[PDB]
Design an enzyme around this catalytic site. Structure first.
Site, PDB file in Angstrom:
ATOM      1  N   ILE A 240      18.143  23.514 -10.715  1.00  0.00           N
ATOM      2  CA  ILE A 240      18.647  22.244 -10.185  1.00  0.00           C
ATOM      3  C   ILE A 240      18.115  21.998  -8.785  1.00  0.00           C
ATOM      4  O   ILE A 240      17.834  20.852  -8.411  1.00  0.00           O
ATOM      5  CB  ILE A 240      20.186  22.179 -10.222  1.00  0.00           C
ATOM      6  CG1 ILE A 240      20.704  22.594 -11.609  1.00  0.00           C
ATOM      7  CG2 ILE A 240      20.679  20.749  -9.856  1.00  0.00           C
ATOM      8  CD1 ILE A 240      19.975  21.943 -12.790  1.00  0.00           C
TER       9      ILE A 240
ATOM     10  N   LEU B 237      21.457  27.775  -7.946  1.00  0.00           N
ATOM     11  CA  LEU B 237      21.175  27.104  -9.221  1.00  0.00           C
ATOM     12  C   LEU B 237      19.712  26.672  -9.156  1.00  0.00           C
ATOM     13  O   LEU B 237      19.391  25.553  -8.745  1.00  0.00           O
ATOM     14  CB  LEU B 237      22.078  25.896  -9.459  1.00  0.00           C
ATOM     15  CG  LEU B 237      23.555  25.804  -9.072  1.00  0.00           C
ATOM     16  CD1 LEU B 237      24.270  24.738  -9.894  1.00  0.00           C
ATOM     17  CD2 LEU B 237      24.267  27.132  -9.141  1.00  0.00           C
TER      18      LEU B 237
END
Ligand SMILES: Cc1cc2nc3c(=O)[nH]c(=O)nc-3n(C[C@H](O)[C@H](O)[C@H](O)COP(=O)(O)OP(=O)(O)OC[C@H]3O[C@@H](n4cnc5c(N)ncnc54)[C@H](O)[C@@H]3O)c2cc1C
Ligand SMILES: Cc1cc2nc3c(=O)[nH]c(=O)nc-3n(C[C@H](O)[C@H](O)[C@H](O)COP(=O)(O)OP(=O)(O)OC[C@H]3O[C@@H](n4cnc5c(N)ncnc54)[C@H](O)[C@@H]3O)c2cc1C
Ligand SMILES: Cc1ncc(C[n+]2csc(CCOP(=O)(O)OP(=O)(O)O)c2C)c(N)n1
Ligand SMILES: Cc1ncc(C[n+]2csc(CCOP(=O)(O)OP(=O)(O)O)c2C)c(N)n1
Ligand SMILES: COC1=C(OC)C(=O)C(C)=CC1=O
Ligand SMILES: COC1=C(OC)C(=O)C(C)=CC1=O
Ligand SMILES: COC1=C(OC)C(=O)C(C)=CC1=O
Ligand SMILES: COC1=C(OC)C(=O)C(C)=CC1=O
Ligand SMILES: [Mg+2]
Ligand SMILES: [Mg+2]
Ligand SMILES: [Mg+2]
Lengths: 594, 594, 198
Positions: B480, B477
């Site tokens: 993030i 991700l």
């Protein structure tokens, strides 16, 4: 003791004190401070999902697997919260809790249009016991404290806590040593209520107990069986009560309803003169028209929630009580009635119920190619132990599964019975396995259910969470095809196509073996009924060897009409019935389970 | 003419008269009567999705693709409606409509606990212009009539119509020949407002126009370019205005903001003395702190919605108007000012902006193995024509894509800019292709976005909907991870695992080639930067040959930090910058597009 | 023992067992069945107010006078409920209960713009612990049973019960002798807490 820390740090101590050990989630910028506090604290194992809806259904499966569990779902602001609504609805509808925690925009920006900020409080209110944006850092532990009281008290349901970024990082003073969980509220029936209930039960000549999900919710299954044994009263579980008395128990009389039901269960209910309802509601799929369900029958209803009593029919006796408190008193009063010689003998009525259960069957032992689904469930009953724990959602897959599989302990049927969201099965099964790594978890999906959240199989691969997924593939939305017969049509329900990479699926469309393998799992496809049993054996071996999910896909015939109808006395049998064990060899009357 | 028919039959005539030709959906029992009426009517093409969230995002992509389109999403009761909330939020947040239609329990059972029945009206109210359970059959056509007025009028947004089963089948009398759509409400600026706006623009010495999504929403892109050409004023599109003036136009000055922005766009905004805002809002990701964005600048703001004006900053001149009405008058007044010799010459300011655009670049031409993402977008600019239409959602994939790709016509950047729900990209791209089979659709996802709703690729296979999906895979991700650097951690953001079926993915986890192929699509994986361009060429060929989605997966290096910051003057450049065309060869200043 | 009676007759037995002896109100056509049942039951003294807002504050004063008291405020459909909102806010704001009961249009006509019919449920939700339109006659005793639990438990606050005319007059089977008030929820501090405070 007392110390300065971030509000999220106090939140970790609170979750620890409330017994949280696991979370499912997807991080994002707005919820990073909570993840930072969770990393610093240790002792919550986080499982990263591949859809926020997957994390939320994992939390549901974790809650449902073991009494007192509360699954936790974590997400960022904006679309993460809106992706949790289906799970909040599913958990609310079945009276079970999950705790959803979302990040949020900083307080001072809540009514501007900040990036990925949404009014999740208003959206989630209809499907939660509490949905609150926390507006002060010192309130973060208090909101969690009130959340846990509500998830455990009364009729259980889920809570969503929404955390603005600045609230999360703000410093507070907090003493974990002084934190204590709130008392749980659960009303209890009085002796006067229970003696009246036992009086009416003694007066009935052909009673049945209908045992609902509230019995399991109260962790009262052993008491339920003990009460039925003392009174010699046959037990009809609802779909949500299924498992609270073993399926091979002499008093287990089958299930009742319009779909997930047995011919003998419905026949026994219509022959009874009293329904003793404990922890059930009287759901429309269970009753049909209430005028027919209650005809000629006294109705008792014990429910923890006052406004559930009288909601769909007027009971002769309604009692507000937790199911465990009520069953403790019911055992005590029945023991007193037994010492006094006042419990009637029920050998004749029990023999009539057992005669119905022996003769009113449905055929499962089909040798057809392409495979008939009912044969799959017969092979599952033979292949897996009595300790098997099934996970399923909805479709002809699930309805016939409930008609034909057997279960022997409470919380070994894990099913979202009121909401039925497609895609629930894979993440719920992973959540059960996370709750209990020794559980023998076997999931059942149709192809459409399996596709919704298919990507969650990679969660099982990344974290080595093993279970067996039975996939029954008709290349159809089969339940919707069958319901479309009343409109004389077959329209927008087919999933078949000529797969340009796989002529071996023979026009069934998606190649689930290839997809499951690309996601890091193992998979076996079965075309012939005699190959089902060896496939379940290889799957157990592959599961022990690689410790990942193993998919067993059975290629069904395209069209099978499952038995169902509009009333208990109107269920249509499309496929062959049976009155002999050879056609239906895995009924407990004929087969010793494990 | 006048005839008796079911309410759903009248609903089909209404949708026909409102220009509906397409629907995306998932049938179920509670919405079967509507599907029956849709089959009987003909002339709505239905595309069956493999998640209800997929149908709802397809409807969004269909709306966004072409002015005046309204995507329709269809679903059953219960969890289908709760699965639509993320799309209703996404469409609301970007001011675009979709029409969601759900089945519902019969009116008389709405407050019982009927199977799969939920209060979708209350859940959807915060994210729709209207969400209504229709309580009378004769109201079904009137609610749809009011829905279309609201989806088109004022600030556009979505509508959900919830249809109880008995309301759907009930007979009514209806005359399709008498049905007419309601007038659309759109306020228009007065000449007094526009002459004042042009007066302030003539007085500014270094003005910029900031052209927002409202210009495209009004179908006013050609007028926007004409007004900028007459006044010789440089144009800064927002992310939602991107495409309303071609990227190779001499007045297109780049984009501004904290993330999806150019170094030269931000530098030009901070050097300007006026921001002429047309159809923008002043979003936080675009402005940073508003005190810095407005420092030393006059601010004009034209918006169709009165309560958008002044919401985040106080403009010097705020005007309520549809962007097309306002731009028609602005062209007329500027032509009058040009005939009068009153428009100042702007050669110096335009030359300063072009000098910034020529020199303040970011490097894309990386030969690194494993591949650097910025090289992927350089190859996409070379591989695809000037008529390419990109579809994307969020992540480092999307942010760097917006920093480095180029677009040349309005509605060729299809992006959910305010809500950013993961999984949007595949279904939105299918919806664009359904709106316009001649559109040259190219989607961009990271691996996590791609996994959320990966099953929708099989929709493209079953219905032969071809487009190219660029998949940039870092097994992270990534956005993030980068935001977690402020918390000095890297926690719950990795997707890598040793795939037990594919040692060739080298621990990246999911094998997207195998998954895409099992779903019936074609796929190519690329490890080296020089193989990207031939892969895009094979993909075009495979797409023409099989007419299905073709996935091109580029294996990225695990960690790349994309440029971003907290203010326009504080954007951190982690990777190499460039001031020469060799490092950044696809800037329009250096490259002729098609 | 158990007997056929109207839902409002069962409501009178419930109010009796829960200790109500007084009500302040203004009658109207939509709440007449409740008034008929109160008159037949006897033993609730009704005080007729000269403004619905006055009945609602009489109920507040009745609650506040004596521990355990719960003032009851009766009104008809439509504007009677909207006239009770200020008292519901004032009772909530001070953590004290009142029980408001309003008449309402029959269920089949709840979304039909019937005369003097309003969505009092939605209006009163922000200023009550519970505000509910009762949709089954058999639920009338149970809604009242839950209301008294909510008005006594936790942080106290008021409840509004909204009764459709057809729900009021429908017959149900109800046994007053078997009715029992619910237990009151009140958390208690532990000794570890109190020793730390001292
Ligand atoms: C396709 C499909 C077909 C189905 N077919 C059938 C069918 O034929 N027959 C059937 O019966 N079901 C069927 N179901 C399931 C059905 O929809 C319901 O979910 C189920 O019948 C409800 O079971 P229950 O009455 O035990 O209720 P539950 O939802 O389990 O809840 C019952 C009550 O328990 C109470 N409660 C909660 N906690 C406690 C506690 N601690 N103590 C006491 N009470 C408590 C709650 O207040 C609630 O009123 C089907 C579902 C699907 C998806
Ligand atoms: C990861 C990420 C990073 C981003 N980074 C940036 C960034 O650096 N910079 C940036 O600018 N954006 C960025 N965005 C996009 C950003 O969040 C906003 O979506 C965008 O800036 C809003 O554009 P806009 O002002 O044109 O507003 P829109 O949402 O397009 O709406 C503007 C206005 O148009 C009005 N309107 C509607 N119809 C009409 C009509 N007919 N006539 C007139 N007005 C009308 C509406 O009332 C509204 O006020 C990013 C998004 C993501 C997901
Ligand atoms: C989100 C959602 N949309 C629609 C439905 C309605 N629905 C119930 S069963 C079903 C078809 C399921 O098909 P599959 O899983 O293949 O099972 P089969 O019935 O063919 O065995 C559908 C669409 C639902 N339950 N949830
Ligand atoms: C439903 C949802 N949950 C969480 C997020 C927060 N989010 C934004 S980008 C991102 C990671 C995306 O990763 P990937 O698509 O692999 O792209 P990368 O940044 O690695 O290029 C996440 C979790 C979101 N936008 N939507
Ligand atoms: C089930 O898939 C579908 C088709 O394929 C047979 C069609 O031809 C049409 C018109 C709709 C559809 O859903
Ligand atoms: C003897 O064991 C058995 C029963 O219990 C008496 C039954 O009820 C049935 C139906 C079969 C059986 O074998
Ligand atoms: C990113 O995947 C994750 C792990 O794998 C490295 C972990 O070890 C832990 C503790 C969390 C996690 O999310
Ligand atoms: C001559 O064409 C060109 C421009 O327009 C003048 C520009 O603004 C830039 C930056 C490059 C260019 O080649
Ligand atoms: Mg998916
Ligand atoms: Mg199927
Ligand atoms: Mg990634």
């Amino acid at each position: 003791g007392m110390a300065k820390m971030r509000a999220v740090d106090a939140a970790m101590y609170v979750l620890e004190k409330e017994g949280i050990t696991t979370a499912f989630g997807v991080p994002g910028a707005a919820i990073n401070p909570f993840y930072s506090a969770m990393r610093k604290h240790g002792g919550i194992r986080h499982i990263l999902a591949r859809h926020v809806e997957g994390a939320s259904h994992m939390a549901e499966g974790y809650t449902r697997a073991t009494a007192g569990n509360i699954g936790v779902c974590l997400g960022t602001s904006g679309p993460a919260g809106t992706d949790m609504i289906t799970a909040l609805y599913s958990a609310s509808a079945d009276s079970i809790p999950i705790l959803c925690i979302t990040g949020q925009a900083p307080r001072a920006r809540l009514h501007k249009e900040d990036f990925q900020a949404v009014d999740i409080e208003a959206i989630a209110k209809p499907v939660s016991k509490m949905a609150v944006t926390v507006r002060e850092a010192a309130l973060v532990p208090r909101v969690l404290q009130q959340a846990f009281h509500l998830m455990r008290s009364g009729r259980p349901g889920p809570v969503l806590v929404d955390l603005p970024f600045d609230v999360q990082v703000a410093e507070i003073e907090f003493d974990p040593d002084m934190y204590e969980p709130l008392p749980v509220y659960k009303p209890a029936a009085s002796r006067m209520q229970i003696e009246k209930a036992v009086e009416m039960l003694i007066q009935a000549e052909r009673p049945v107990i209908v045992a609902g999900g509230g019995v399991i919710n109260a962790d009262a299954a052993a008491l339920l069986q003990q009460f039925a044994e003392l009174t010699s009263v046959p037990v009809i579980p609802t779909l949500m009560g299924w498992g609270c008395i073993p399926d091979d128990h002499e008093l287990m009389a089958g299930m009742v309803g319009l779909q997930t039901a047995h011919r003998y269960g419905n026949a026994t209910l219509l022959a009874s003169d009293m329904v003793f309802g404990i922890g059930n509601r009287f759901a429309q799929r269970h009753t049909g028209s209430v005028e027919k369900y209650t005809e000629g029958r006294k109705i008792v209803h014990i429910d923890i929630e006052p406004t559930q009593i009288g909601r769909v029919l007027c009971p002769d006796l309604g009692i507000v009580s937790d199911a465990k408190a009520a069953l403790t008193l019911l055992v005590e009063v029945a023991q007193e009635m037994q010492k006094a010689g006042r419990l009637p003998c029920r050998k004749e009525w029990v023999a009539d119920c057992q005669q119905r259960k022996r003769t009113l069957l449905r055929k499962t032992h089909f040798d057809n190619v392409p495979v008939k689904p009912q044969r799959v469930y017969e092979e599952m009953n033979k292949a897996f132990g009595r300790d098997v724990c099934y996970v399923t959602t909805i479709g002809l897959s699930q309805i016939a599964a409930a008609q034909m599989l057997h279960v022997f302990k409470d919380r070994h049927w894990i099913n979202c019975g009121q909401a039925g969201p497609l895609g629930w099965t894979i993440p719920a099964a992973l959540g059960v396995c996370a709750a209990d790594p020794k559980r023998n978890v076997v999931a059942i999906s149709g192809d459409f259910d399996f596709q919704f959240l298919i990507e969650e199989l990679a969660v099982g691969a990344q974290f080595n969470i093993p279970y067996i997924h039975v996939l029954v593939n008709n290349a159809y939305l089969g339940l919707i095809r069958q319901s479309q017969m009343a409109f004389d049509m077959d329209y927008c329900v087919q999933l078949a196509f000529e797969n340009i990479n796989s002529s071996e699926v023979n026009g069934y469309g998606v190649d689930h073996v290839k997809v499951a393998e690309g996601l890091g799992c193992k998979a076996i496809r079965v075309f012939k009924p005699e190959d089902i049993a060896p496939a379940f054996e290889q799957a157990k071996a592959l599961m022990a060897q690689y410790r990942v999910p193993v998919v067993v896909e059975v290629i069904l015939e395209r069209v099978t009409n499952i038995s169902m109808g509009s009333e208990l006395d109107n269920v249509m049998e499309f496929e062959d019935i049976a009155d002999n064990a050879a056609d239906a060899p895995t009924e407990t009357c004929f087969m010793h389970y494990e």
